[PDB]
Design an enzyme around this catalytic site. Structure first.
Site, PDB file in Angstrom:
ATOM      1  N   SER A  51       8.300   2.709  -2.762  1.00 48.88           N
ATOM      2  CA  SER A  51       8.214   3.372  -1.471  1.00 48.88           C
ATOM      3  C   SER A  51       7.995   2.335  -0.383  1.00 48.88           C
ATOM      4  O   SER A  51       7.048   1.554  -0.463  1.00 48.88           O
ATOM      5  CB  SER A  51       7.076   4.398  -1.477  1.00 48.88           C
ATOM      6  OG  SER A  51       6.916   5.053  -0.231  1.00 48.88           O
ATOM      7  N   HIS A  74       0.863   4.800   7.546  1.00 54.61           N
ATOM      8  CA  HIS A  74      -0.149   5.447   6.731  1.00 54.61           C
ATOM      9  C   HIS A  74      -0.139   4.848   5.338  1.00 54.61           C
ATOM     10  O   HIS A  74       0.905   4.795   4.686  1.00 54.61           O
ATOM     11  CB  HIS A  74       0.104   6.950   6.663  1.00 54.61           C
ATOM     12  CG  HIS A  74      -0.870   7.680   5.796  1.00 54.61           C
ATOM     13  ND1 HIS A  74      -0.494   8.708   4.966  1.00 54.61           N
ATOM     14  CD2 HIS A  74      -2.199   7.517   5.614  1.00 54.61           C
ATOM     15  CE1 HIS A  74      -1.550   9.148   4.313  1.00 54.61           C
ATOM     16  NE2 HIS A  74      -2.597   8.444   4.690  1.00 54.61           N
ATOM     17  N   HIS A  92       0.801  -1.221   0.000  1.00 58.62           N
ATOM     18  CA  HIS A  92       0.000   0.000   0.000  1.00 58.62           C
ATOM     19  C   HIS A  92       0.831   1.268   0.000  1.00 58.62           C
ATOM     20  O   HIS A  92       0.280   2.355   0.141  1.00 58.62           O
ATOM     21  CB  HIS A  92      -0.953   0.021   1.200  1.00 58.62           C
ATOM     22  CG  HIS A  92      -0.267   0.049   2.530  1.00 58.62           C
ATOM     23  ND1 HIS A  92      -0.747   0.779   3.592  1.00 58.62           N
ATOM     24  CD2 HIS A  92       0.843  -0.576   2.978  1.00 58.62           C
ATOM     25  CE1 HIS A  92       0.053   0.626   4.626  1.00 58.62           C
ATOM     26  NE2 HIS A  92       1.028  -0.191   4.280  1.00 58.62           N
ATOM     27  N   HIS A  93       2.135   1.158  -0.142  1.00 57.32           N
ATOM     28  CA  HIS A  93       3.017   2.306  -0.138  1.00 57.32           C
ATOM     29  C   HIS A  93       3.476   2.699  -1.532  1.00 57.32           C
ATOM     30  O   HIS A  93       4.026   3.786  -1.697  1.00 57.32           O
ATOM     31  CB  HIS A  93       4.256   2.005   0.710  1.00 57.32           C
ATOM     32  CG  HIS A  93       4.133   2.364   2.158  1.00 57.32           C
ATOM     33  ND1 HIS A  93       2.942   2.690   2.761  1.00 57.32           N
ATOM     34  CD2 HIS A  93       5.075   2.443   3.124  1.00 57.32           C
ATOM     35  CE1 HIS A  93       3.154   2.957   4.035  1.00 57.32           C
ATOM     36  NE2 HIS A  93       4.442   2.818   4.281  1.00 57.32           N
ATOM     37  N   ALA A  94       3.276   1.841  -2.529  1.00 58.16           N
ATOM     38  CA  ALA A  94       3.897   2.023  -3.831  1.00 58.16           C
ATOM     39  C   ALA A  94       3.253   3.167  -4.592  1.00 58.16           C
ATOM     40  O   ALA A  94       2.030   3.209  -4.754  1.00 58.16           O
ATOM     41  CB  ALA A  94       3.792   0.744  -4.645  1.00 58.16           C
TER      42      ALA A  94
END
Ligand SMILES: [K+]
Ligand SMILES: [K+]
Ligand SMILES: [Zn+2]
Ligand SMILES: [Zn+2]
Ligand SMILES: [Zn+2]
Ligand SMILES: [Zn+2]
EC number: 3.5.1.98
Lengths: 369, 165, 74, 820, 284
Positions: A140, A171, A132-134
């Site tokens: 990321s 987050h 969920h960071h990409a």
């Protein structure tokens, strides 16, 4: 009416680096328990169709999806300026067999969405991928391809409204940035705001454009216990279901919100983490439950297994059967995971103030001209 | 030696200083009015008082010398470090163009301002030079929609890492 | 010739400031009260756009809504 | 107690003003009057016939009654919300009419039967019996009807499963009355600007409010920023703020809606979004179509910050016993990853071979293959061969594999299997050491406090901290109630349990008997004489059973003592005055009392901390099951677990157990839930070091001797302490005692830091009273019933000559009633 | 050599020099190349407008430097200074412990909003532009952490949070505006015993009896209404339910929920609305 489960046996064999906190190993451990608990006769196990190069560009840029496809650890001086433009190289490292890992994760979650779209599954699981960071143009925080932002777009084809809940300790900021100006995907995230990783996720970051008041951020302090979390979690999600009124949910059940995590700050436990899944499950919406974080693998392997059996409608005994990694599971060889006694920093003042502010923002669609 | 600067120009200079050395923003280098149009536009407005001939010749000499000279300082001393990267890229997208054709008067007032220093090595010519420097300054500030930008550009995300961010 | 938009600090007196404020806010309050009174008597056309524009707290919305929902119902 | 009285009165006020419904009143009262079951039982007289508290066990469990069920006390501070209830009603009727579509007369009987109840013609228990008759086949509907009943209303800050909210909420800002100050404080032109200068006393807080008004005047901010930025200026005056809300014509049902949006921002995107340059907004993703460029954000980026810890995940330090389970986990992972990869490769190559050897025998000899054979995941296959096969010599082994995969295939399968068996052999022989390190570090990894509490609590038990806390509590109460604060009682302690109150003193003098071989002619004089002066003890059972310590029976038996019966007998019954060194003892003593009370209440769940470690049958394959009751030394043999923990604390005190054995004992029984006993030796050292101060030091010995000698006479005490001033150097406190409720109480009265005072008057002359608050009450009733009282007299001070200058013609005159 | 760029004083990949030992980021150097010069570098070791353009051509041989400002333009406004590598810093925001109980001027330390100390919620904050303390839990955005102890903090009760940016010439004076109304600006304004102790005791006693009578009369009127408070506030949800189940379009709070439903499904104004029960099949 049978929870569709997505597993590709080749995933456990990918390895980031020397002592990297991320171990894909842990999706194998899970399956071990899942296969010895006599669970996988109750699920509907499916091998994902791997994602091509043309799917991952429905949200990422071609010069990037076509850089992951060609970089190797041996030939990484022929791409030496490309691992600064794209953020690969040192924290999201180049490892043997990167693109096949991305194909596995992305294809699994895109297949879950396709399974929901047809009337064949009402829940669909994929622990391999919840990255969920990409970002659309770079990598990321241990993620390269954003599989959730590819299952959401495929879900946004039969469903008018779609909700994405994020209970990682970090987050989930790529999935928010991918959907920051649309009133069709509401992104809700309970995270630890402070001097903590993503740096983003203020309470004031709440949408733009036509998707203003459609991004919810719940910034907590470190050490939150299992009852403070339930107090701040249940009303927010009940209000989102009353006002937004979704049509399908994507729950990302990350497990660094748990006690004793090498990267997390929270203090949850197995029941303190399972009450969220159990509460979101109770609304009778098509769900997709995907993986996420979790870097202490003995606790992750047991929590995700408990929840797999939870969604499937089955009751698992508290004693771990004979499995191939049993000696990981400590003394006492139990299924539970227990909490620290670490101090909490979330007063009731803090939690009430931020909850009422969020409800203020959520009501502001019929309470405005 | 010392020249006088309109306080509006001091405010604008310090705003640019903070905007690039702290807020990580950029000027969109290809300039609609460049450093070459903004000298012809001054000559064709000042030529109306070119009565005596020696003054015409000195004015012409000064303008030509100073455009070709601004071309010899845009790589040395008219850029902050956060502006060097954007230099290379344009030097690679426009390989053999004169610099006083891409950069604008945002970068040219930096040269007017910085010239009680560079002038230290003195009969008449320095005075007649600084005179046109001052008149150019107040001729630019009068035309704030002819020689200046309406926004500083946001330095791209990939851009920050290449310079030292 | 343009000059600085803020060149110094100004000392003021509290009482001139207070009378200025009372005047300004009296004007604004007189404005808002008649705005309130005129809104109090509007019609909000009956069968007009569904998902109406007005705010939820509008004294004549719940007759527009009533008549269009009784329209659609049989 | 001023706070508790004021909180009760504010909740009653808010019920009258309608900020709070009957549910809100009931629940906030339940939270205010919890220690006062006498007051709740009294209040039950006024409540309606069906809504009464149900106290049990003297007030340890109460549950308000309702019309249909009873409901137990939880607290979150709920309010009311009507839209939510209408949405729940809409949804429930939707589902109900959708379940009964077959026969259109059982939704008719649910329609014409709630109508009767609405008029009056049914009742809760009469309507419910028909609702439970129609929704009989559908047990999930009749379970949602139980949310529209009088019992689900009361404590409803938590929504049920599959249901929209029940109540609304708001903050409360630490008020014992859980009422938000946005609804309390907010529900002439010379009247406003005169007062604002009284409230805003600081002259650079007043100027900063005038500048807000000024930049409203100029045009910079609108009405809402003005009325929401001014709340944080004048809201602690319920008349100033209510005035201001009418001076700007802003009604309070609108300030609520606009308050949150109008105090700050970088709005309309928030602190961490940047607009992309127009050149970047066109980078091309070749797979999207019409639909996905007209959904995905392309305009706004946010990007990974540094406030010192946010680029890369680099998290804080951990206890030295979690750096040893991480390391164990890493070792296991290395071995397991190599073994599992090589096994995947063996299985895959065997599958390739069982397809090359299922053809007719003439084509097998050159049936060729590509570089990665056919495997969609040839990375694993490549890395395992590079590892096993001496990477500098793996190249050819790739090549030979692709051209003759009928001669090389078994030759490499065999080699892979050999290396795999070698790895498994090395692995099986190190699992013992893994288990033996895991058995040490596991328990103190769910216990972080065995490292940090050792210094947190060290700051807790200081003198400077406890004194500073007394002073700040005094000055905080001197501001909420400027009239009813002279009945202060900063700290009020209630020592109801005498079986813990005996054990506290037991322990504090048992520490002294052993660790310090002096006193004991004064340390027992202290505990026998001084403590019953303050504490209201029997003084004869107490000093009998307290000699189980001063003379031995210990260290060979060392049992748990026998207790007196009724150690406590049954306005202030005893008041004494004392300086700081006695206040600190009374602070440490209550710390210890609270510790042992927590410990004694723990032992009811000690039966479910011992079920979490019940044997695992499958681990009875002779791997570890190293049982934890084998590193425990001899466990005591008393009745219940509190006495055993007490014996273990006595052993720790005496030197027969060190801290490690003691903490391991605690962890075995109570889990990680007993972590404030870890430092119970330095606590008792602190208390015993104070008791050794009220008895020596050449300055406080005199104060305690005086307290003892004028104890045989109340008037003598408070005259010599409060109107004659022997003060050495300290603060002055007054410790009370109320027998009926067993309540202790401390209260600052003075300082002792100027003073060559002798006295104005003769203390013999004013002799009436018993207490000192009765003395003050007598003065008050002597002033109210006066026969004359005039106070014209004024004066002024002479600068740098601090004498009074009485301005002429001014006089003062009092006359009492009996004079005439 | 020296380990800082000879132009911008920065760290990173340096092109060093053999003969005249200095360092350059190689894009802070002379005409940027890109990188990659492994052999020896030797980076620049070696009365009318005529002579002044000879100055122009002589500027070549002197090893480039960054641009900063003259001393007169950077040192002109208020609170503006350069860094150490010549960047813009604010020198007016420079120069933490969570639990403070008394200031060094010997005063209590109590929150400005709830009036309670740093013991109800573990921590308090001190303003550097005031004499006020706040609990991070009371600010309205609530601070999840605490600022650094090297930058100053500003409590909610200032107007600097709404005056946009103006910078002052650092030698301006304060002009005393004598103009007793209608002065326009944009936020840049400065602003221009009885010895009665018996009477005090009597005062306090009678005030206390006043307060007691006040609440004694409050409870008299409140406690007699309990029977209707309880009835209405507790049978409310069933009356709402009886109105919805009978479809009372006259309950003007029902049709507002129906409008919320039309506003959630984003109704198109072209179709006709559905009967009030059939719109309720949005819910399930
Ligand atoms: K959104
Ligand atoms: K999150
Ligand atoms: Zn995470
Ligand atoms: Zn440099
Ligand atoms: Zn506060
Ligand atoms: Zn302040």
């Amino acid at each position: 009416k049978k929870v569709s489960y997505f597993y590709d046996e080749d995933v456990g064999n990918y390895h980031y680096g020397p002592q990297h906190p991320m171990k894909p190993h842990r999706v194998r451990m899970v399956h071990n328990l899942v296969v010895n608990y006599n669970l996988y006769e109750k699920l509907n196990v499916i091998t994902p169709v791997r994602a091509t190069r043309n799917d991952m560009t429905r949200c990422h840029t071609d010069e990037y999806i076509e850089f992951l496809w060609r970089v190797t650890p041996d030939t990484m001086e022929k791409f030496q300026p490309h691992q600064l433009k794209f953020n690969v190289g040192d924290d999201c490292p180049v490892f043997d067999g990167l693109y096949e890992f991305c194909s596995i994760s992305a294809g699994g979650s895109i297949g879950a969405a396709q399974e929901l779209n047809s009337g064949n599954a009402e829940i669909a699981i994929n622990w391999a991928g919840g990255l969920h960071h990409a970002k659309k143009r770079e990598a990321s925080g241990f993620c390269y391809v954003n599989d959730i932002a590819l299952a959401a777009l495929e879900l946004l084809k039969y469903h008018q409204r779609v909700l994405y809940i994020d209970i990682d300790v970090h987050h989930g900021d790529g999935v928010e940035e991918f959907f920051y100006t649309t009133d069709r995907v509401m992104t809700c995230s309970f995270h630890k705001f402070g001097e903590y990783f993503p740096g983003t996720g203020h309470i004031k970051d709440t949408g733009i454009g036509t998707g203003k008041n459609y991004a919810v951020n719940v910034p907590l302090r470190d050490g939150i216990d299992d009852e403070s979390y339930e107090s701040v979690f249940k009303p927010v999600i009940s209000h989102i279901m009353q006002w937004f009124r979704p049509e399908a949910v994507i729950l990302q059940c990350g497990t660094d919100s748990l006690a004793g995590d090498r990267l997390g700050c929270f203090n949850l436990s197995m029941k303190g983490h399972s009450m969220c899944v159990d509460f979101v499950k109770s609304f009778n919406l098509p769900m997709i439950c995907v993986g996420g974080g979790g870097y202490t693998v003995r606790n992750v392997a047991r929590v995700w297994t408990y929840e797999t059996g939870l969604l499937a409608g089955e009751e698992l005994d508290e004693n771990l059967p004979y499995n191939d990694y049993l000696q990981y599971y400590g003394p006492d060889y139990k299924l539970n995971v227990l909490s620290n006694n670490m101090e909490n920093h979330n007063t009731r003042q803090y939690l009430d103030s931020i909850t009422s502010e969020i409800i203020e923002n959520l009501r502001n669609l019929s309470f405005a001209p | 030696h010392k020249i006088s600067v309109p306080d509006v120009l001091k405010l604008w200079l310090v705003d640019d200083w903070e905007n690039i050395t702290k807020n990580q923003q950029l000027i969109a280098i290809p300039r609609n009015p460049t450093v070459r149009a903004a000298i012809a536009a001054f000559r064709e407005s000042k030529i109306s008082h070119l009565n005596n001939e020696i003054d015409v010749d000195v004015f012409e000499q000064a303008m030509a010398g100073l455009v070709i000279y601004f071309n010899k300082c845009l790589g040395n001393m008219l850029l902050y470090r956060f502006e060097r990267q954007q230099y290379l890229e344009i030097r690679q997208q426009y390989p053999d163009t004169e610099m006083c054709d891409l950069y604008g008067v945002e970068h040219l007032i930096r040269l007017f301002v910085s010239l009680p220093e560079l002038i230290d090595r003195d009969s008449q010519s320095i005075e007649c030079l600084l005179n046109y420097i001052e008149e150019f300054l107040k001729y630019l500030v009068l035309h704030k929609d002819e020689y200046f930008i309406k926004e500083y550009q946001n330095a791209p995300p990939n851009y920050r890492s290449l310079v030292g961010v | 010739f343009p000059r600085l938009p803020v060149s110094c600090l100004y000392k003021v007196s509290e009482d001139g400031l207070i009378k200025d404020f009372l005047y300004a806010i009296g004007i604004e309050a007189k404005k808002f009260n008649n705005e309130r009174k005129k809104r109090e008597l509007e019609v909000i056309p009956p069968d007009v756009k569904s998902a109406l524009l007005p705010a939820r707290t509008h004294p004549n919305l719940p007759i527009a809504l009533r008549t269009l929902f009784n329209k659609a119902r049989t | 107690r001023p706070y508790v009285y004021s909180a009760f009165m504010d909740v009653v006020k808010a019920l009258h003003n309608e900020i709070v419904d009957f549910p809100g009143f009931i629940e906030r009262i339940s939270v205010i009057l919890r220690d006062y079951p006498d007051l709740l039982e009294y209040l039950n007289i006024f409540l309606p016939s069906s809504y009464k508290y149900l106290l049990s066990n003297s007030g340890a469990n109460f549950t308000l009654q309702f019309t249909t069920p009873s409901g137990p006390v939880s607290y979150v501070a709920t309010y009311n919300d009507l839209p939510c209830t209408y949405h729940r009603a809409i949804g429930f009727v939707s589902r109900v009419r959708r379940a009964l579509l077959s026969n259109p007369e059982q939704f008719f009987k649910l329609q014409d039967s709630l109508r009767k109840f609405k008029n009056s013609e049914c009742s809760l228990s009469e309507l419910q019996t028909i609702v439970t008759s129609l929704l009989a086949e559908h047990p999930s509907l009749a379970h949602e009807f139980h949310n529209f009943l009088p019992s689900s209303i009361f404590f409803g800050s938590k929504p049920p499963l599959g249901s929209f909210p029940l109540r609304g909420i708001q903050s409360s800002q630490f008020t014992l009355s859980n009422i938000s100050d946005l609804l309390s404080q907010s529900r002439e032109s010379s009247d406003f600007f005169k007062n604002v200068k009284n409230v805003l006393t600081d002259v650079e807080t007043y100027h900063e409010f005038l500048k807000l008004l000024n930049l409203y005047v100029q045009g910079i901010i609108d009405r809402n920023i003005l009325v929401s930025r001014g709340f944080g200026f004048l809201k602690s005056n319920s008349g100033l703020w209510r005035s201001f809300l009418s001076l700007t014509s802003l009604s309070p049902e609108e300030f609520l809606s606009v308050y949150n949006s109008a105090c700050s921002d970088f709005p309309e995107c928030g602190p961490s979004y940047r607009l992309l340059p127009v050149e970047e907004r066109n980078i091309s993703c070749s797979g999207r179509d019409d639909f996905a460029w007209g959904i995905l954000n392309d305009d706004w980026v946010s990007h990974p910050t540094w406030a010192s810890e946010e680029s890369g995940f680099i998290v804080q330090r951990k206890t030295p016993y979690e750096e040893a389970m991480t390391k164990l986990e890493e070792e296991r992972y290395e071995f397991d990853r190599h073994i599992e990869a090589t096994s995947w490769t063996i299985k895959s190559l065997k599958k390739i071979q069982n397809r090359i050897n299922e053809l007719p025998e003439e084509e097998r000899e050159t049936y060729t293959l590509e570089e990665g054979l056919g495997l969609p995941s040839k990375s694993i296959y490549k890395k395992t061969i590079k590892l096993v096969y001496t990477s500098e010599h793996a190249e050819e082994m790739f090549k030979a594999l692709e051209r003759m995969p009928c001669l090389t295939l078994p030759l490499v399968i065999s080699r892979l299997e050999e290396k795999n068996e070698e790895w498994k052999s090395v692995k099986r022989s190190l699992q013992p050491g893994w288990r033996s390190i895991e058995f040490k570090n596991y328990d103190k990894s769910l216990d972080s406090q065995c490292v940090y509490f050792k210094a947190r609590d060290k700051k807790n038990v200081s003198s400077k901290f406890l004194l500073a806390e007394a002073d700040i509590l005094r000055s905080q109460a001197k501001l909420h109630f400027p009239l009813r604060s002279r009945s202060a009682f900063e700290f009020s302690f209630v020592y109801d349990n005498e079986i813990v109150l005996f054990d506290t003193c037991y322990m504090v003098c048992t520490y002294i008997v052993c660790n310090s071989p002096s006193g004991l002619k004064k340390v027992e004089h202290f505990f026998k004489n001084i403590l019953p002066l303050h504490f209201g003890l029997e003084k004869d059972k107490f000093s009998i059973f307290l000699d189980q310590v001063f003379r031995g029976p210990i260290k060979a038996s060392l049992k748990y003592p026998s207790h007196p019966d009724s150690l406590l007998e049954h306005d202030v019954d005893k008041e004494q005055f004392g300086y700081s060194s006695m206040y600190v003892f009374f602070r440490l003593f209550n710390l210890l009392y609270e510790r042992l009370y927590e410990l004694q209440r723990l032992e009811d769940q000690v039966s479910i901390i011992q079920q979490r470690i019940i044997p695992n049958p499958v681990s009875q394959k002779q791997k570890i099951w190293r049982d934890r009751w084998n590193d425990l030394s001899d466990v005591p043999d008393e009745k219940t677990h509190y006495e055993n923990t007490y014996v273990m604390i006595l052993r720790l005190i005496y030197g027969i157990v060190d801290q490690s054995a003691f903490e391991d004992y605690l962890r075995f029984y109570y889990g990680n839930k007993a972590y404030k006993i870890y430092t119970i030796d330095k606590l008792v050292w602190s208390a015993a070091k104070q008791v050794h101060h009220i008895v020596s030091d050449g300055k406080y010995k005199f104060v305690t001797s005086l307290v003892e000698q004028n104890s045989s006479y109340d008037d003598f005490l408070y005259r010599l302490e409060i109107e004659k001033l022997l003060n050495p150097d300290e603060i002055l406190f007054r410790f009370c005692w109320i027998n009926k409720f067993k309540s202790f109480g401390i209260k600052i009265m003075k300082r002792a830091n100027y003073k060559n005072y002798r006295c104005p008057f003769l203390c013999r002359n004013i002799e009436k009273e018993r207490t000192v608050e009765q003395l003050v009450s007598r003065l008050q009733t002597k002033l109210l019933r006066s026969a004359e009282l005039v106070s014209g007299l004024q004066a002024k001070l002479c600068l740098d000559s601090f004498k009074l200058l009485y301005l002429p013609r001014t006089e003062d005159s009092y006359i009492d009633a009996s004079y005439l | 050599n020296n380990d800082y760029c000879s132009a911008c004083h920065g760290p990173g990949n340096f092109l060093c020099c053999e003969t005249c030992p200095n360092s350059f980021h190689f894009t802070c150097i002379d005409p940027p190349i890109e990188e990659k010069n492994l052999p020896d570098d030797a980076w620049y070791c070696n009365t009318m407008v005529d002579v002044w353009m000879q100055l122009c051509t002589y500027i070549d041989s002197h090893n480039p430097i960054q641009f900063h400002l003259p001393h007169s333009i950077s040192s002109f406004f208020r609170g503006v200074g350069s860094g150490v590598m010549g960047e813009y810093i604010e020198t007016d925001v420079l120069k933490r412990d969570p639990l403070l109980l008394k200031s060094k001027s010997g005063t209590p330390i109590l929150c400005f909003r709830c009036h309670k100390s740093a013991l109800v919620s573990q921590s308090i904050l001190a303003c550097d532009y005031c004499n006020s303390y706040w609990h991070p839990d009371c600010l309205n955005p609530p601070l999840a952490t605490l600022p650094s102890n090297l930058r100053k903090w500003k409590c909610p009760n200032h107007s600097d949070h709404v005056t946009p940016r103006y910078r002052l010439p650092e030698k301006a004076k304060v002009i005393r505006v004598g103009l007793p109304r209608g002065f326009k600006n944009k936020g840049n304004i400065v602003i221009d015993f009885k010895l009665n102790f018996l009477e005090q005791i009597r005062d306090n006693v009678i005030n206390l009896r006043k307060m007691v009578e006040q609440d004694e009369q409050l409870c008299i009127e409140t406690f007699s209404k309990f029977d209707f408070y309880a009835t209405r506030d507790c049978e409310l949800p069933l009356r709402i339910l009886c109105d919805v189940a009978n479809d009372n379009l006259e309950n003007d709070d029902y049709v507002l929920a129906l409008r919320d439903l039309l506003r959630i499904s984003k109704w198109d104004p072209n179709q006709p609305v559905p009967a009030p029960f059939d719109l309720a099949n949005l819910l399930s």
